[PDB]
Structures are given as C-alpha cells and as structure tokens.
Design a binder for this molecule. Structure first.
Ligand SMILES: *[C@@H]1O[C@H](CO)[C@@H](O[C@@H]2O[C@H](CO)[C@@H](O)[C@H](O)[C@H]2NC(C)=O)[C@H](O)[C@H]1NC(C)=O
Ligand SMILES: *[C@@H]1O[C@H](CO)[C@@H](O[C@@H]2O[C@H](CO)[C@@H](O)[C@H](O)[C@H]2NC(C)=O)[C@H](O)[C@H]1NC(C)=O
Ligand SMILES: *[C@@H]1O[C@H](CO)[C@@H](O[C@@H]2O[C@H](CO)[C@@H](O)[C@H](O)[C@H]2NC(C)=O)[C@H](O)[C@H]1NC(C)=O
Ligand SMILES: *[C@@H]1O[C@H](CO)[C@@H](O[C@@H]2O[C@H](CO)[C@@H](O)[C@H](O)[C@H]2NC(C)=O)[C@H](O)[C@H]1NC(C)=O
Ligand SMILES: *[C@@H]1O[C@H](CO)[C@@H](O[C@@H]2O[C@H](CO)[C@@H](O)[C@H](O)[C@H]2NC(C)=O)[C@H](O)[C@H]1NC(C)=O
Ligand SMILES: *[C@@H]1O[C@H](CO)[C@@H](O)[C@H](O)[C@H]1NC(C)=O
Ligand SMILES: [Zn+2]
Lengths: 450, 100, 50
C-alpha cells in the first residue's frame, strides 16, 4: 500500500539524519568553544553536507500523498519534509531574496551614527548607543541618540523592506497560504484530532481576547511610571498625555527595565542579593551547577549524565583559547547534552544556571522520539520551562534553604512590592509592545496597510 | 502567558498557601510527574493536548498572570488615587510650538 | 593646532551607494588617486576629500 512504503522511507531516513546531524553539531560546537580559522571551514563543510541531505530527502519525499495516512506520528513527520519553503520561488527571485536579507542584516550590524559637533567619532549600536539609551539621564542626549538611529539607519532599510514583503508574499502564496503572516501563524495549527483542533485564524482572536484583561493593569502601571517620570524630567511630560518614546529605558521601548532606578517604590530598603554570601562560602562555577542539579532531582526529574560533566564548558577558559559564551544548552544527539557558558560567581548567573539546565532537562525527556519530533510542543514552549525553573529558584524561601540568606531574615511587605515592581517592568511592560508589533506586521503582509 | 499557567498549575499541585509569587516547587515529587508527562512528548502531540496534560485547559489564559500580580495591582490602585489613569492620544511634545 | 592635525589624520569619506564603508586618506584615498584610471572615480575621491 502507501503506508508501509512511507513507514519504510521514514525508517531509512532516520539513521542518516541522526548521524549527519551529530557530526554537523560537533563541528559547530568545536568551533564555538574554540574560535580558530581552522574550524570555521570545517563547520561550514559539515553544515553544507547536512543542508544538502535535507534538501534531497525533502524532494524525495514529495511523492507520498498526504491525505492517505492515518498514523498521526507519520503524517506529523511527513508534513515537516514536504514543506517546500523558499525553493518554489524562481531562481533569480530567490537569489535577490537572499541578497536583500543579507543587506538588511549587515546594515543593522554595521550602521553607525556620529556627533554633530565632532564628526570623527561615530558610535555603533551595540556598544555605544545602547549604553547611552540605557544609562543616560539627559533629555537632549537621549533624543539625539533616538533620532539619529532612525534617521541614519532606518532610512536605508525602507526600499529594502518594500521588496522584502513582496518577495515573501510570493513565496507564501506559492505554498497555498494567504500571505506571509498566515505562513508564520502556521506553527500553532492543529488538524484533525477531534477536540483539539486549532486554526490559523483563531490565534488572532485569542491574542486580541487575552489582551483585554491586561489593559486594566497595564494602564495603572503606565500611570504610575508617568507620575514618576514627571519628577526626573520636569516640564517635558504632560500629566495626562502619553510618554515620549525616547525616555523609556532602551532604544525601542521593548523592555521597561532600566526605569527601575527612577521608579523604585521604597528606595531605601534594598533588594535580596546573595553575591556576597556566595563568595564568603567559597562558591566557584562548579558548586552552583551541583546545586541546580540537586534542585531538579528534588522534584523527581533524573540526574545529569557523565558526558555532561566531562565535555561541558562550565567555566571561562581564560587563556588564549577564545570562545563566545552567550549561555546556551546543546543536544548534539545520540545522548550528548552539554551547556556552554562562562559562569561568573554572581547571582544573575546562579539563575541562568537553572534556566539552561531546565532547557537541558526538557531535551533529555523527549530523547526517545523520532528525529523530526524532538522540539517543544510549539515554539513558545521551550523557553517557558526555563523561565519557571528560574522563577521558582529566586525566592527567599529557597535561598534560605540552600545555605545563602542567613535564616534570621524577615522579608518585609515592602521588599515584596519592590520585587514585584521590578518584575512587572519587564513582563507587563513588554506585552503591549509585542502585541502592537506583531499586529502591524500581520496587517502589512495583507495589503491592509497601503 | 504559558509561563504563568504552568506555574499556577504546579504549586497548586505542590499544595501552596500564600500568594502565587512565593510558591516554590522544590521537594514536591507529585508536582514533578505532572510536569514530566508533558515534557516527554516533544512534538508528537497537538500542543493543545500537551497544555491539557498540565494546566487542565486547552487555551491561553490570562487569569494566572493577573493572579501573580495581585498585591502590586492593589497597591497601585491605591497610589493612583490622586491622578489620571489613562492617556489621551492628542498631546505631543512638539504641539505647542507648531504653527498651523 | 591639535584639532586641525587630528581632523586631517582621522577624517574619512564614504561611498554614496554603501554608506557603511568609509575610507581614510592614507590607505584608501591615496590608493585610488595614485592607481585608478576611471574619470568618475577620481572625481569622486577628489571632491569628497575637499
Ligand atoms: C582549538 O583548535 C585548534 C585547531 O583549530 C586545536 O589545535 C590542535 O590541537 C591538537 C591537540 O592540542 C593538535 O594535535 C593539533 O595539531 C592542533 N592543530 C593545530 C593546527 O594547531 C586546539 O587543540 C583546539 N583547542 C583545544 C583546547 O582543544
Ligand atoms: C505508527 O507507526 C509506528 C511505527 O513507527 C507505530 O509504533 C510501533 O508500534 C508497535 C506496536 O506495539 C511497537 O511494537 C513499535 O515499537 C512501535 N514503533 C515505534 C518506533 O515506536 C505506531 O503504533 C503507529 N501508530 C498507531 C496509532 O498504530
Ligand atoms: C513542492 O513544490 C512542488 C513544485 O516545486 C509542488 O508541485 C509538485 O512537484 C512534483 C515534483 O515532481 C510533481 O511531481 C507534482 O505533480 C507537483 N504537484 C503539483 C500539484 O503541481 C509540490 O506540490 C510542493 N509541495 C507542497 C507540499 O507544497
Ligand atoms: C527538601 O527536604 C529536605 C528534607 O526533607 C530538606 O533537607 C533538610 O534541610 C534542613 C534545613 O535546610 C537541614 O537542617 C537538614 O539537614 C536537611 N536534610 C537533608 C537530608 O538534606 C531540604 O532543605 C528541603 N528543600 C527545601 C528547598 O526546603
Ligand atoms: C505592610 O504592612 C504594614 C503593617 O500592617 C502596613 O502598615 C499599615 O497599613 C495599614 C493599612 O492602611 C494602616 O492602617 C496602618 O496604620 C499601617 N501601619 C503603620 C505602622 O503605618 C503597610 O501598609 C504594608 N505595606 C503596604 C505597601 O501597604
Ligand atoms: C544522582 O547523582 C548523585 C551524585 O551526584 C547521587 O548521589 C544520586 O544517587 C544520583 N541519583 C540516583 C537516583 O541514583
Ligand atoms: Zn532559554
């Protein structure tokens, strides 16, 4: 029939997929933990030898008709291969799409603005404009940074974004989607389970419906922050108007975190910080990970595996062996999980330890699935378990137990408010920005905005 | 959103008492299984069913997020009594030196 | 005096079509002006420096 054939094809696929993935990931790891010009080309060789196998196996599978299979774990894998992606686009169009994408990315990475009075000192975004926008307290300096970024760099991206939407819309309509936004929403779709279905159109209604219960709290937050900024910038803020966009902590207003120093409710009571008590008890970047692992094993999850302890890069190498250590977890395959991060002995790393180890503990759980069915249930599920593991470990009732935060420490109901306001400045302050941005993009990928 | 649903369904299984923002999952094996049998699914199930296996619902909910910030909400409703809660979309920083 | 000297040492000009590649005088504009054989490229360098 058609089923046995499809099942045998997936069986034959899995072996090679697994092995090639392992070798490509090993290449990329060895490059990341060891920045050498030797390894760059090697990682690129492995990467292309994986990409080609993927493309070939995808076209070889375009022959199995979909709506004949009833085994759900088979249709689920086949749907992930038959996905044509950007191949359906004509050749020259696909090449211009790539040129546009790389141009936009490198304009963002290497754009720079410079002073009006000394044109021979220009600042990039990452070191130098982020710093102004995050630290400064001068109205005119913030306005200058905010305006120059959007005038010197945003104006270069207009003609490119205009063509990007057209090409992406073509690529999407050539895959039986309405537009590109409908292609992005296709990650939340469920089809044919009789009770659990979910359509790409429902996502819009769900987010517009959930954003109604948040406005009552977001506008009290907004009012409090405005009444507190009317003291650091007198005469510049109307007491019934909006907030000027350049006075919000960072370049885009995505997070309101850097407003904490201005709006802390009880400014004299301090926060809970255990950096000191950690150094005094002689904690290096190896006891914090045993602590994280012990926390996880308390709840019932399994231990760590030796290869984790052996191959991991828990500490900064220090010597000439350079390695970019944005904290990350890795699931190289075949049973090799390992994290890479340069742990400094502070508190904000005692938390990232729990975050990343939660990522790992997610991965070790579904490691008995077919290679294409190893991910979070959808795209938002993976970071959302790291977050809760990191959130339960920062509470005084836990720190008091693991040794830090000497027992005679009474948490006042004022430090509680301090902590909750530091939390709400990044969680609640960022929901309306996210909603507005995705709403705007969904509407321009429809010709709804001329 | 999920970040809070999960948590509100977890310490509700670790038998917590106080406010949500204090609950700790540690030392509660019965709140481990409730989480574990959602992890070991990967993408082999609809995400709706996976969410069901922990929360007990099938959708995004905003009620746990609001219950997390209840003390802050009351304290704010208190601090904002002598003020205007809301905004008007007509004022702008440059509107008083403009000519029409 | 120091301002003038350092303006000369660190001044730079950049392309009209790719504003994210700027050239200093010593390596990069001297090279154009000494080697090139294109009228418009020479005119561009000559005019942008001044
Ligand atoms: C980082 O990478 C370099 C090469 O990219 C590694 O250098 C090799 O090291 C092994 C053992 O030390 C030698 O047998 C090779 O001859 C070396 N090759 C070269 C070109 O020098 C280096 O070992 C890597 N760093 C670590 C810590 O493994
Ligand atoms: C879908 O096909 C898979 C095969 O990949 C079936 O899973 C097998 O089920 C038998 C029945 O006990 C087991 O002996 C095998 O070990 C299973 N294979 C794997 C890889 O797990 C699955 O049963 C099929 N789906 C349905 C609903 O029958
Ligand atoms: C993926 O793209 C191809 C064309 O780029 C789509 O069309 C099929 O292509 C195969 C190639 O051998 C033909 O045998 C089929 O007859 C084509 N079908 C149709 C309807 O033209 C293919 O349908 C695309 N797959 C998906 C899932 O969109
Ligand atoms: C989890 O439970 C264990 C035992 O039920 C706790 O371990 C005890 O903690 C107290 C104070 O922290 C110590 O005096 C005991 O010696 C510990 N006993 C053992 C066997 O470790 C542990 O603290 C609990 N975890 C949390 C976070 O409260
Ligand atoms: C923290 O708890 C204290 C103790 O109850 C609160 O202070 C009291 O608040 C009530 C509420 O109006 C007043 O009636 C009392 O007069 C207060 N006591 C004192 C000594 O001032 C305090 O309000 C709580 N924190 C917050 C932010 O409300
Ligand atoms: C987990 O590892 C610790 C040592 O790191 C060990 O004492 C413990 O027994 C292990 N867990 C189990 C279930 O054996
Ligand atoms: Zn993460």
């Amino acid at each position: 029939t058609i089923e046995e054939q499809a099942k045998t094809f997936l069986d034959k696929f899995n072996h090679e997929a697994e092995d090639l993935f392992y070798q490509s990931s090993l290449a990329s790891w060895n490059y990341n933990t060891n920045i050498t010009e030797e390894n760059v080309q090697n990682m690129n060789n492995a990467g292309d030898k994986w990409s080609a196998f993927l493309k070939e196996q995808s076209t070889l599978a375009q022959m199995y008709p979909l709506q004949e299979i009833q085994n759900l774990t088979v249709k689920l894998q086949l749907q992930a291969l038959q996905q044509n992606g950007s191949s359906v686009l004509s050749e020259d169009k696909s090449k211009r799409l790539n040129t546009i994408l790389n141009t936009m990315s490198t304009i963002y990475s290497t754009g720079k603005v410079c002073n009006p009075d000394n044109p021979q000192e220009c600042l990039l975004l990452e070191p130098g404009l982020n710093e102004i926008m995050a630290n400064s307290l001068d109205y005119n300096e913030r306005l200058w940074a905010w305006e120059s970024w959007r005038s010197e760099v945003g104006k270069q991206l207009r003609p490119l974004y205009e063509e990007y939407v057209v090409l992406k819309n073509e690529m999407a309509r050539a895959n039986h989607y309405e537009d590109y936004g409908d292609y992005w929403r296709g990650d939340y779709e469920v089809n044919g389970v009789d009770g659990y279905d979910y359509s790409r159109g429902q996502l819009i209604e769900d987010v517009e419906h959930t954003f109604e219960e948040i406005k009552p709290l977001y506008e009290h937050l907004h009012a409090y922050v405005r009444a507190k900024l009317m003291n650091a910038y007198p005469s510049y803020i109307s007491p019934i108007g909006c907030l000027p966009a350049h006075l919000l902590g960072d370049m885009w207003g995505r997070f309101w975190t850097n407003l904490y120093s201005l709006t802390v409710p009880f400014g004299q009571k301090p926060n809970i910080d255990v950096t000191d008590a950690m150094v005094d008890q002689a904690w290096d970047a190896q006891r914090i990970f045993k602590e994280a692992e012990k926390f996880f094993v308390s709840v019932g999850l399994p231990n760590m595996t030796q290869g984790f302890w052996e191959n991991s890069m828990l500490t900064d190498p220090g010597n000439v062996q350079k390695a970019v250590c944005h904290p990350t977890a890795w699931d190289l395959g075949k049973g090799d999980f390992r994290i890479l991060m340069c742990t400094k002995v502070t508190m904000d790393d005692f938390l990232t330890a729990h975050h990343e180890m939660g990522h790992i503990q997610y991965d070790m759980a579904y490691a008995a699935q077919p290679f294409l069915l190893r991910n979070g249930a959808n795209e938002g599920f993976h970071e959302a378990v790291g977050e809760i593991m990191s959130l339960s470990a920062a509470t005084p009732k836990h720190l008091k137990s693991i040794g830090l935060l000497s027992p005679d420490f009474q948490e006042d109901n004022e430090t509680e408010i301090n902590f909750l306001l530091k939390q709400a400045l990044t969680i609640v302050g960022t929901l309306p920005f996210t909603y507005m941005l995705e709403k705007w993009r969904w509407m321009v990928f429809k010709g709804e905005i001329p | 959103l999920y970040q809070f649903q999960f948590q509100e369904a977890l310490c509700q299984a670790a038998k917590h008492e106080g406010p949500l923002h204090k609950c700790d999952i540690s030392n509660s094996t019965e709140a481990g299984q409730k989480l574990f049998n959602m992890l070991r699914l990967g993408k082999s199930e609809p995400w709706t069913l996976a969410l069901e296996n922990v929360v007990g619902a099938k959708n995004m909910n905003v009620r746990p997020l609001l219950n997390y910030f209840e003390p802050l909400f009351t304290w704010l409703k208190d601090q904002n009594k002598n003020s205007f809660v809301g905004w008007s979309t007509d004022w702008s920083p440059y509107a008083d030196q403009s000519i029409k």
